[PDB]
Ligand binder design. Structure first.
Ligand SMILES: Nc1ncnc2c1ncn2[C@@H]1O[C@H](COP(=O)(O)OP(=O)(O)OP(=O)(O)O)[C@@H](O)[C@H]1O
Ligand SMILES: Nc1ncnc2c1ncn2[C@@H]1O[C@H](COP(=O)(O)OP(=O)(O)OP(=O)(O)O)[C@@H](O)[C@H]1O
Ligand SMILES: [Cl-]
Ligand SMILES: [Cl-]
Ligand SMILES: [Cl-]
Ligand SMILES: [Cl-]
Ligand SMILES: [Cl-]
Ligand SMILES: [Cl-]
Ligand SMILES: [Mg+2]
Lengths: 365, 475
């Protein structure tokens, strides 16, 4: 199975729609495709070729989104390293992933990694002149993105294009799409909650509002300058309900398990969620209509859930197991884990939970 | 490779959303799943077994929706049949599909087919009871779900095998194109045995969206239905659109999308549509692509007169002549590609051979792309007329003949002489000098395209889908 490259096609369809807003600048999908194609050509100098793995160590910046896309446009597996890890946790992942290159800037030490992988500077690269024929097709089964978990030795999740597509498509079926929808990301892009938005973006043709970090003053401000409708966050960011109800603009906040009592019915629409690196973001959600159920919601469309071993009756504890086309086929270079992980199509999550009488998920600490 | 049954799962997730609105009687997804599972067990009692092929012959009713989902839950290929087919045409498709059963009702002549297939009556079937069964919990994406015959406009009708994969991707791409909300409802007033209508049944379970179902298109009933049930989406052909326009000042507030298939809307229909606030999405598509594969948003309606639009997300078009790709505006055959395109015809090897190149399907339509990639559909490759150094595209001519307004229906075929010369066949509102309107044609058409002779009739050779048979006007 295959699909024409999401970014390319998105550009051909609605070229002057806004892809990325970062700082105060704007990128159209026409620009984003042009950006990503340039970088892709400039990496092709440097000997980067189809089939290679390339790691990315960067903060949320326009140039990171180009970087992801330039990899796809080359056919390069991308590894997005967590910048808040120690340098050694990262060197482990570079060797384990088979990375031939690391793309980063001047805020990190390239000398700390040059001994393992050829090192490339984003800004110094953007200035170079280069000749290249892109990959117009994405294979739905090819790995797109290799993301690590971190609880034994972190396993490298092979996230396919297909996984990402079905993740985005299933989230739409669940929350709906709108031509004036805009998603705000104040979370790190190397984490899946933020990487998913990038793919949602090209697939829906939706705008993403990108912030390097979560500043309440600078976030609740750009929500109004830019009319954000969609925002994904953790409890901590939510905690900043300094003002106080929710703007008119916001129709959805996407979420660990909920704390105590909302706080606040008046007046934010908060969606609770259960997901993991292996499910390429959420697989289960709880609509604000029933904020007072617990606790995690029901399975997304096209996805499945059993609390099992074995197959447990309603309201009785067991091992949560997930299934669906948004779930990864296999960990990278983990034969033992792959066999241990999967029972007949299902993924053993290693989590404690049950389903109530109506089939809602309840995750346990 | 596999998904949970969309009806089951929809029933598990949002059990109290309205699935169906028929008459004004409403049916939930829980109720729909129940109805269907019920009907399923009943059918299983008639030796209807997983892997068989039940054909369905029904007017748009709730019981038809049940029957389609039932076949899914039993693992049975559902063949749906055009209820305006002649007995002969109908028996042909029953034989050719390898149908064992024919689910229908008393509105038809059951015993007239009782020799080829085990008939069954939808209503008398609902009355009985049988052993509960299971399940069938999973749709295999690459399995034929439904089998749908083309209209046979250009030869003996082909059976299109439409996979669950196909239907799923058709629903998803359309949603990427049009958006989807909780508040959305879709009104089908065209037959459910047409892909335009059937695909709404799948849009429903997958989105969890209410389908407002009508047994036929009566403009007053539609307008009432639209407002009473707060309909936001409607599928329509050019005549249905022209009628909704006549009977309104402004467009119903509830409506946000009118998906127009079947052919382009002429410029006056559109300006009136823009003046009156009608949001019209023109579209191109076929049975083989499981409804629309190309659409054009209202914003480009006037700017791109005569265009079907651009491909839906995940889908592709291209234009080829003699194996080579075509420059912008260069005429050639429309070819399509996508997860929503059927992978193969049912039992038509010659057609499968000649219609696929590399994942691409040859539609047998001629068209072109403009510099920006917008599609323009000309005409069927088969009804092309070559008056030497042609071409005359009969739809080009026919379009000008309509809007006389003397002309109500117009058709054009090629006679032969010293290469082929265009003849036109007209149905008349009023009387028209002939011509002028040859002069009426002269202004809006190059000299070689104008019809040499004009003939007159009361009806034109149409098949069971009201489609013009141009090869048979010479009669
Ligand atoms: N909202 C949530 N509520 C409860 N538990 C959660 C939630 N989100 C994630 N988890 C837990 O965290 C996991 C997802 O995190 P991730 O997969 O990135 O790391 P991990 O699975 O903890 O680490 P490892 O690589 O060792 O498997 C899930 O297995 C789940 O058990
Ligand atoms: N927007 C449009 N503009 C112009 N022509 C269209 C448009 N939409 C559909 N068509 C025509 O309608 C055809 C689809 O018809 P359908 O598949 O329902 O039966 P059929 O293809 O005519 O029959 P067969 O191929 O078996 O002879 C397309 O091939 C195309 O020729
Ligand atoms: Cl645009
Ligand atoms: Cl959209
Ligand atoms: Cl519900
Ligand atoms: Cl599609
Ligand atoms: Cl929805
Ligand atoms: Cl001549
Ligand atoms: Mg055809």
């Amino acid at each position: 199975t295959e699909q024409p490259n999401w970014l390319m096609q998105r550009a051909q369809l609605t070229p002057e729609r806004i892809a990325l807003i970062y700082e105060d600048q704007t990128v159209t999908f026409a620009e984003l495709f042009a950006a990503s194609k340039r970088m892709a050509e400039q990496l092709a100098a440097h000997s980067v070729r189809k089939g290679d793995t390339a790691a990315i160590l960067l903060q949320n910046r326009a140039e990171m989104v180009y970087a992801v896309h330039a990899c796809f446009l080359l056919g390069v597996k991308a590894v997005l390293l967590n910048t808040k890890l120690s340098t050694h946790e990262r060197l482990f992942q570079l060797e384990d992933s088979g990375s031939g290159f690391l793309l980063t800037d001047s805020s990190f030490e390239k000398k700390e990694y040059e001994h393992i992988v050829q090192t490339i500077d984003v800004d110094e690269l953007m200035k170079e002149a280069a000749e290249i024929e892109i990959e117009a097709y994405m294979q739905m089964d090819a790995t797109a993105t290799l993301m690590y978990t971190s609880t034994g030795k972190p396993k490298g999740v092979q996230q396919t294009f297909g996984n990402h597509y079905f993740s985005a498509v299933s989230s739409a079926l669940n929350l709906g799409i709108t031509e004036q929808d805009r998603w705000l990301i104040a979370l790190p892009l190397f984490h899946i909650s933020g990487l998913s938005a990038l793919f949602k973006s090209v697939i829906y043709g939706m705008t993403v509002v990108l912030h390097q970090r979560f500043s309440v003053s600078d976030v609740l401000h750009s929500i109004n300058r830019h009319e954000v409708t969609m925002i994904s966050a953790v409890q901590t960011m939510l905690a900043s309900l300094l003002e106080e109800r929710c703007p008119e603009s916001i129709r959805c906040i996407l979420l660990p398990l909920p704390l105590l009592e909302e706080c606040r019915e008046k007046g934010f629409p908060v969606f609770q969620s259960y997901g993991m690196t292996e499910t390429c973001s959420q697989i289960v959600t709880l609509s604000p209509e029933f904020s007072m159920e617990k606790s995690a919601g029901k399975p997304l469309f096209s996805c499945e859930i059993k609390i099992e071993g074995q197959v447990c009756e309603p309201y009785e504890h067991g091992e949560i197991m997930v299934k669906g086309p948004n779930v990864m086929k296999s960990y990278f270079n983990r034969e033992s884990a792959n066999e241990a992980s999967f029972q007949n199509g299902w993924l053993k999550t290693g989590d404690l939970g049950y389903l109530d009488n109506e089939g809602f998920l309840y995750v346990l600490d």
